[PDB]
Amino acid sequence: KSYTTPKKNKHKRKKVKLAVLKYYKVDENGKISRLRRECPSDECGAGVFMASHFDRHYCGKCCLTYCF
Amino acid sequence: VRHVLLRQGVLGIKVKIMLPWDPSGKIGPKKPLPDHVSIVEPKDEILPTTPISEQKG
Amino acid sequence: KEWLPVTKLGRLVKDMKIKSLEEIYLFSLPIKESEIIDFFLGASLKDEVLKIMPVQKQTRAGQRTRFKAFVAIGDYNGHVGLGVKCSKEVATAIRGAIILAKLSIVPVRRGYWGNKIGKPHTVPCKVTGRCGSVLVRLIPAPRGTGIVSAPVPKKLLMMAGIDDCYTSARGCTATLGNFAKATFDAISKTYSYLTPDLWKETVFTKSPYQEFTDHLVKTHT
RNA sequence: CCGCCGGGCAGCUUCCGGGAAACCAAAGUCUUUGGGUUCCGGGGGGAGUAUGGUUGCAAAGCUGAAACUUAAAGGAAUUGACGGAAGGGCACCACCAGGAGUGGAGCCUGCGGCUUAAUUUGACCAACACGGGAAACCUCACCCGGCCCGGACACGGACAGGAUUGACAGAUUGAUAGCUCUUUCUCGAUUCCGUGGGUGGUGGUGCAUGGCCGUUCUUAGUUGGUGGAGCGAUUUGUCUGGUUAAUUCCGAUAACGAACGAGACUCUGGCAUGCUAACUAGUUACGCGACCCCGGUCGGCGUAACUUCUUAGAGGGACAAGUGGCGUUCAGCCACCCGAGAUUGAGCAAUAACAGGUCUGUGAUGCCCUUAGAUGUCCGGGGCUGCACGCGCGCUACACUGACUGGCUCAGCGUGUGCCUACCCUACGCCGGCAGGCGCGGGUAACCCGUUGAACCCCAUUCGUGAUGGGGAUCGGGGAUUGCAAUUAUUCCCCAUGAACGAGGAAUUCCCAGUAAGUGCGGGUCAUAAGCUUGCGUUGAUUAAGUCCCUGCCCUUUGUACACA
Numbered sequence: 001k002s003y004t005t006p007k008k009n010k011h012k013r014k015k016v017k018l019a020v021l022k023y024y025k026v027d028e029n030g031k032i033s034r035l036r037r038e039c040p041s042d043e044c045g046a047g048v049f050m051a052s053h054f055d056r057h058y059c060g061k062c063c064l065t066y067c068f
Numbered sequence: 069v070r071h072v073l074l075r076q077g078v079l080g081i082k083v084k085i086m087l088p089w090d091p092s093g094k095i096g097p098k099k100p101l102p103d104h105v106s107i108v109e110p111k112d113e114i115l116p117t118t119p120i121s122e123q124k125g
Numbered sequence: 126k127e128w129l130p131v132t133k134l135g136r137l138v139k140d141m142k143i144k145s146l147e148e149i150y151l152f153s154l155p156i157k158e159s160e161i162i163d164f165f166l167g168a169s170l171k172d173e174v175l176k177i178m179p180v181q182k183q184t185r186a187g188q189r190t191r192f193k194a195f196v197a198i199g200d201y202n203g204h205v206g207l208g209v210k211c212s213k214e215v216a217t218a219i220r221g222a223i224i225l226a227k228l229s230i231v232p233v234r235r236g237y238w239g240n241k242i243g244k245p246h247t248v249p250c251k252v253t254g255r256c257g258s259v260l261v262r263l264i265p266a267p268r269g270t271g272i273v274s275a276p277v278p279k280k281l282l283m284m285a286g287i288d289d290c291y292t293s294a295r296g297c298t299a300t301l302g303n304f305a306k307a308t309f310d311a312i313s314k315t316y317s318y319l320t321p322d323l324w325k326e327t328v329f330t331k332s333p334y335q336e337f338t339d340h341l342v343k344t345h346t
Numbered sequence: 347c348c349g350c351c352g353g354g355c356a357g358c359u360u361c362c363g364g365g366a367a368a369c370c371a372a373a374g375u376c377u378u379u380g381g382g383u384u385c386c387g388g389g390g391g392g393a394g395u396a397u398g399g400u401u402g403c404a405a406a407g408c409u410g411a412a413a414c415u416u417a418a419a420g421g422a423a424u425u426g427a428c429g430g431a432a433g434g435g436c437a438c439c440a441c442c443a444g445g446a447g448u449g450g451a452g453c454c455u456g457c458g459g460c461u462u463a464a465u466u467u468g469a470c471c472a473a474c475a476c477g478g479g480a481a482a483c484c485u486c487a488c489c490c491g492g493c494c495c496g497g498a499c500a501c502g503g504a505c506a507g508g509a510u511u512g513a514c515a516g517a518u519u520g521a522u523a524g525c526u527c528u529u530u531c532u533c534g535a536u537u538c539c540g541u542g543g544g545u546g547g548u549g550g551u552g553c554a555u556g557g558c559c560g561u562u563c564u565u566a567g568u569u570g571g572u573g574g575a576g577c578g579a580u581u582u583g584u585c586u587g588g589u590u591a592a593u594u595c596c597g598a599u600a601a602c603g604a605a606c607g608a609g610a611c612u613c614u615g616g617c618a619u620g621c622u623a624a625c626u627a628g629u630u631a632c633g634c635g636a637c638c639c640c641g642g643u644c645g646g647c648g649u650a651a652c653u654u655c656u657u658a659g660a661g662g663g664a665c666a667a668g669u670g671g672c673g674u675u676c677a678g679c680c681a682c683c684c685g686a687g688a689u690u691g692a693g694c695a696a697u698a699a700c701a702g703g704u705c706u707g708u709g710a711u712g713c714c715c716u717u718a719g720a721u722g723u724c725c726g727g728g729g730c731u732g733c734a735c736g737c738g739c740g741c742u743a744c745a746c747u748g749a750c751u752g753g754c755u756c757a758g759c760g761u762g763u764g765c766c767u768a769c770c771c772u773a774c775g776c777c778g779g780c781a782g783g784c785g786c787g788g789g790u791a792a793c794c795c796g797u798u799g800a801a802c803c804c805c806a807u808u809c810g811u812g813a814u815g816g817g818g819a820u821c822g823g824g825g826a827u828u829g830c831a832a833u834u835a836u837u838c839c840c841c842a843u844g845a846a847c848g849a850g851g852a853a854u855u856c857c858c859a860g861u862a863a864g865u866g867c868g869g870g871u872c873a874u875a876a877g878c879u880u881g882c883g884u885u886g887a888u889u890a891a892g893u894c895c896c897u898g899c900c901c902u903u904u905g906u907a908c909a910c911a
C-alpha cells in the first residue's frame with residue numbers, strides 16, 4: 001500500500017555534446033585525420049569507432065577489445 | 069454474492085431469489101417443487117339412471 | 126391498490142352510505158379497518174412519532190432487539206388516536222403504529238369554561254387517565270391559556286384541538302408509553318363522563334347495520 | 347336429613363373495584379382526593395453505631411445522633427442462562443457387553459521449549475500428518491551479502507555546443523553484477539535532478555471488513571399477519587395426552603391461516619434371463635489350428651446368431667402394501683409370509699449468533715508503516731530439519747495365529763504426452779545381482795499399459811520359545827536415478843552393523859454389518875516422492891437392538907441475589 005524503501009536514480013542518458021570533437025581532427029583546409037581508432041568489424045567496416053573509456057582498448061556495438 | 073467498495077470499507081451482498089414455477093421454463097424452472105401435489109379437479113358428470121343406447125351410422 | 130373491504134361497516138363506508146364517523150361512534154361499532162378513518166378524515170389527519178423505543182428480549186445467542194414505535198395521530202378538530210407497535214425494523218413498526226392509531230381514534234368532547242360564548246375550547250370537566258401508574262388530570266381553563274403540560278400530553282391535547290387546558294400528572298411520567306396512553310385515556314373518557322346537559326333521554330336512531338341491511342344483502346354476501 | 351337468622355375461623359368463583367405487579371370482597375368505596383383516631387417511613391450505607399439519660403443482678407432492653415462515604419440500593423413481573431432441582435425423551439463426537447487400540451519402545455511428522463544471524467509465521471472439544479505446510483534451489487515471508495526500478499504521470503530545471511544505456515579488459519567481487527575504481531566508446535530524446543503524486547508487500551490489524559469455512563448444534567429448532575391476555579417487557583399459536591428418528595402426525599384448543607428447518611429432494615448401494623443396443627464389451631455355437639489318451643483344454647485364429655455376464659439409458663420395483671396381535675382402534679408399534687430389498691450410505695440443510703479462523707488465496711479490501719542504504723523484486727549461500735526436555739497425529743513391532751524360502755490363485759476405484767508447461771502411463775526385446783541403463787513400439791484412452799496376473803490369504807519347506815531366522819533403529823562402505831546443484835546422508839538398491847521393545851502406569855480414542863480390524867492398490871502433493879490424507883477393493887468377526895449412571899443434547903415445570911449469563 002504504503003512503501004518502506006524509496007527510489008534513487010535509474011541508469012541515465014546524456015547531455016553535454018559534439019562528442020565527435022574528440023574523434024576527428026582537421027586543419028583549416030582539406031585535411032581530415034582521426035584521433036581514435038577504427039573498428040575492423042564485419043557488420044560495420046568503416047563507420048563505427050573504437051573506444052576511449054578508462055584504461056585499455058575496446059569498441060562498443062560489436063564490443064570487441066584491443067589491449068596491451 | 070458480490071462486493072461493494074466504499075470509502076469507509078467493504079460491503080457484501082447476497083441476493084437470493086426464489087423463482088416461480090412455470091411450465092414454459094423461460095421465466096423459471098420446469099419441474100414443480102417435490103412436495104407440491106396438485107390434484108386435478110373432477111369435471112362433473114351425472115350418472116344415468118336408465119340404460120340408454122347410442123345407435124348411429 | 127384499491128380498497129376491497131372485508132368487514133361490513135367498511136363495505137358501507139366505501140359504498141358511501143354513512144355520512145360521517147360520528148354515527149359509527151354513536152353506535153360504538155368496532156372499527157377494524159384503517160381505510161375508514163382516512164376516508165372520513167384523510168385530508169387533515171396528521172401524525173407524530175412520539176418516540177422509537179428499542180426493547181429487547183434475550184435469547185440463547187445474544188439479544189433480540191425489536192423497536193417499538195409510538196404514533197399519535199389526529200386532526201386538529203375533535204379526534205385523537207394513539208398507536209403502539211412493536212416490530213423488528215423501525216419503518217414497519219412506525220407504519221403499523223399509524224394503522225393502529227387510525228383504528229383507535231376516539232372522538233373528543235370539548236366544552237366551555239364559565240360563559241359559553243363562541244366555539245368550545247377546553248375539556249368539559251375534570252377528567253383523569255390512568256394506566257401503568259401515571260395519572261393524567263385534564264382541567265378546564267380560561268380561553269387563551271394554552272395547554273400547560275409536558276411535551277407529550279401537550280402534543281396529544283393540541284392535536285385533539287383542546288387548545289387550552291390545565292394538566293396535572295402524578296406517577297412515573299418518564300415512561301413515555303404509559304404517559305401518552307394515559308393522556309389519551311383521559312381525552313377518551315371525556316365523552317364517557319356524564320354531563321348534566323346530557324339528560325335528554327335518547328331518541329334512538331336506526332342502526333347502520335339495520336338501515337342498510339338490504340344493501341348489505343345485495344352488494345356482498 | 348332440608349332450609350332461615352346472627353357472628354366465627356376459613357375456602358371457591360368473578361372485568362364490583364383497586365394496584366408497579368404478584369394479588370386482594372379488601373390491600374375496594376382515592377385527583378370524582380375529607381367517617382373518627384393512634385403509631386410510624388423520607389434514597390443506600392455509617393447504624394440501631396457512638397455519646398447522654400433511664401431500666402436490669404447480668405446478658406441486655408427503651409430513647410438515639412453526627413462526621414463520613416455512595417449512583418444506585420430495592421419491589422413485582424418477563425425472557426434467557428444456570429441448578430450436586432424434578433418429570434419426560436436422545437447420541438458409541440456418551441455409557442453398559444465388548445472389539446481394535448492409544449499412553450510404554452524405536453522411528454516419521456506437527457507443537458511448546460531451548461539454541462541461533464535466522465532456526466519467520468497463522469491456530470493452543472472447535473490448535474497440534476492442520477494452513478491442502480511431504481521447504482535441497484524456487485516456494486520463502488526469515489537471516490547474511492550483492493544487482494535491477496518494475497519513480498506511472500504532472501510542474502520547473504539543465505537541456506540532437508549528446509543528462510551517459512549496455513559495456514570484454516585489469517583491479518574489486520562470489521558471480522563473466524560494468525556493483526564500483528584507473529581507455530569515456532557505442533547508443534540517440536526513451537528519459538532523469540528537485541518537486542508533488544501513484545504503484546508493489548506472504549508487512550501490521552481477522553479487535554476495521556467482505557467472501558469462504560468451522561462451531562454453538564446433527565439435534566429439532568425458529569419466525570411473521572390478523573385475533574385473545576397484559577400498562578409493559580412478553581405471551582398465545584409453538585399444547586394436556588398418545589405416537590414418531592423429527593414442532594412427525596392423530597388429536598385437543600382463544601386461536602385461525604401461513605413460511606423456514608425435519609421431510610420431500612439429488613447422487614450412490616441392491617433387483618430386472620422383460621425393453622433399447624454394441625469390432626473401443628462379451629457370451630454361445632461353427633470352421634480351422636495346437637495338445638492329450640469320440641471326448642477334454644486354449645485370454646489360439648476367423649465369422650453365424652444373441653445380450654445372461656459388461657457397459658447405461660428409459661422404465662419398473664416397496665407402500666408399513668398383506669396377514670396376526672397391541673393402541674382413542676386414530677396416529678402408529680411389534681412379529682411373519684411374499685420377497686433383490688420390510689431402517690445402504692452420503693450431499694444439501696433454518697432463525698439467531700462467536701468479536702472462532704483466514705489481510706500468508708486473490709488485481710476483494712479500509713486505515714497505518716517506512717521517503718534507497720528494499721518489508722518490491724531478483725540472484726548467491728544458509729535457515730524453515732538445529733536438540734539436556736514435555737505433548738499430539740501416526741508407521742513398525744514385541745513373534746509359532748509367526749518369520750523365512752519356494753509354489754499356487756483372486757479385485758475395484760481410478761490416472762496417463764500439459765496454453766505458458768519445456769517434465770506422461772508404459773507393454774515388448776537386449777545388458778546388469780539390484781537400483782537401473784539401451785533400443786524400438788501402443789495410448790489424448792471400454793482400444794495401449796491391462797484379463798490391471800496386488801497383497802493379506804492358500805499350499806509346501808526350514809526355523810523352535812533363545813532378544814531367536816522376532817524387531818530393524820543406529821551406523822561404515824560401494825553403486826544407481828531426478829536435478830543447475832544432495833553436504834544437514836533427496837530417493838532407490840547391495841553388503842555389513844543389530845539398539846530398545848517379553849502386550850505397556852494413571853488416563854483415554856473410535857466403532858455396532860460387509861461394520862471394527864488386518865491387507866494391499868489408485869488420486870492429491872510430485873522433477874525426484876507417502877510413515878499423511880482422500881478414495882478403493884480384498885479377508886472379515888466378538889458383542890448390542892439398551893440406558894440415563896458418567897459426558898453432553900432437546901422439551902416442560904419450578905428456583906435464582908446470575909444477564910461480559
Ligand SMILES: [Mg+2]
Nearest residue numbers: 376377379380
Ligand atoms: Mg388521601
Ligand SMILES: [Mg+2]
Nearest residue numbers: 388389390391
Ligand atoms: Mg435513610
Ligand SMILES: [Mg+2]
Nearest residue numbers: 418419420421
Ligand atoms: Mg435492582
Ligand SMILES: [Mg+2]
Nearest residue numbers: 437438891892
Ligand atoms: Mg443407538
Ligand SMILES: [Mg+2]
Nearest residue numbers: 441442443444
Ligand atoms: Mg467402554
Ligand SMILES: [Mg+2]
Nearest residue numbers: 449450737738
Ligand atoms: Mg508418549
Ligand SMILES: [Mg+2]
Nearest residue numbers: 448449450451
Ligand atoms: Mg508411543
Ligand SMILES: [Mg+2]
Nearest residue numbers: 480481482836
Ligand atoms: Mg523434501
Ligand SMILES: [Mg+2]
Nearest residue numbers: 481483484486
Ligand atoms: Mg529455500
Ligand SMILES: [Mg+2]
Nearest residue numbers: 483484486725
Ligand atoms: Mg533465497
Ligand SMILES: [Mg+2]
Nearest residue numbers: 547548705708
Ligand atoms: Mg497482496
Ligand SMILES: [Mg+2]
Nearest residue numbers: 552701702703
Ligand atoms: Mg473473527
Ligand SMILES: [Mg+2]
Nearest residue numbers: 552553701702
Ligand atoms: Mg478473534
Ligand SMILES: [Mg+2]
Nearest residue numbers: 004714715716
Ligand atoms: Mg515509522
Ligand SMILES: [Mg+2]
Nearest residue numbers: 456479481730
Ligand atoms: Mg515447519
Ligand SMILES: [Mg+2]
Nearest residue numbers: 815816817818
Ligand atoms: Mg528379521
